Amino acid sequence: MLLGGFVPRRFSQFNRDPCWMFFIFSVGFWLGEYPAMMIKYNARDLVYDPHRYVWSHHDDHH
């Protein structure tokens, strides 16, 4: 119902309550997983599967 509770004023206060500490940890995970995907999936050495035209989900569901 969103009636009350501890509310940090800014980022630096997220460490003043264990629950918000876990929340900021989770937010860090969430936002930092995107740069990781950028680096991993736009890598120079990433190579498409040679057999990618052998089979695809598009033919299977069709």
Partner 1 sequence: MQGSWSVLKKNCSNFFPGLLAFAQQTQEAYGIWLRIYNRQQKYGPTDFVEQSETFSPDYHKRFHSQDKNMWVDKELCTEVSQKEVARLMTYKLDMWRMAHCAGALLATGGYAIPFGLFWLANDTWVPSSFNLTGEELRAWREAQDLYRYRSAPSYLTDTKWHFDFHAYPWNETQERAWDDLFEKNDVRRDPKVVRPAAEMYDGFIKFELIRRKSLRHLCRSMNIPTFPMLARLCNGTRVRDYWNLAWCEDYMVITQRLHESMTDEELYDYAWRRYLAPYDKNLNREQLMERVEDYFEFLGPDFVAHGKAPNLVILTNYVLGYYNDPAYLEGDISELDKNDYDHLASWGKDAFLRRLEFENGPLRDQVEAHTQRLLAERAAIAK
Partner 2 sequence: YNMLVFRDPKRRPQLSEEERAKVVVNQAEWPEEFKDFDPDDPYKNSPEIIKGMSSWNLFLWGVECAFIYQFYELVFPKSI
Partner 3 sequence: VGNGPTFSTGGECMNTCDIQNAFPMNDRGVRSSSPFQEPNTAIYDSYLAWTYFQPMDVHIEKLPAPEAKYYQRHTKKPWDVSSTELTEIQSRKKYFQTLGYLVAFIYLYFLMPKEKSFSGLSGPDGHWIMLPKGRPELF
| List of residues contacting partner 3 (CB under 8 A) | 1-4
- Compute CA 18 distance to the chain's CA centroid, rounded to the nearest angstrom: 22
Closer CB to partner 2, 18 or 50, in the complex: 18
Residues 2 to 61 in contact with partner 2, rule: CB under 8 A? 2-9, 11-18, 21, 24-33, 36-37, 40
The interface mask with partner 1, positions 13-32, x = CB under 8 A, is ---xx---------------
**Buried residues in 52-62 as b, exposed as e (16+ CB within 10 A):** eeeeeeeeeee
Q: Which residue has the tokens 């500490």?
A: 21
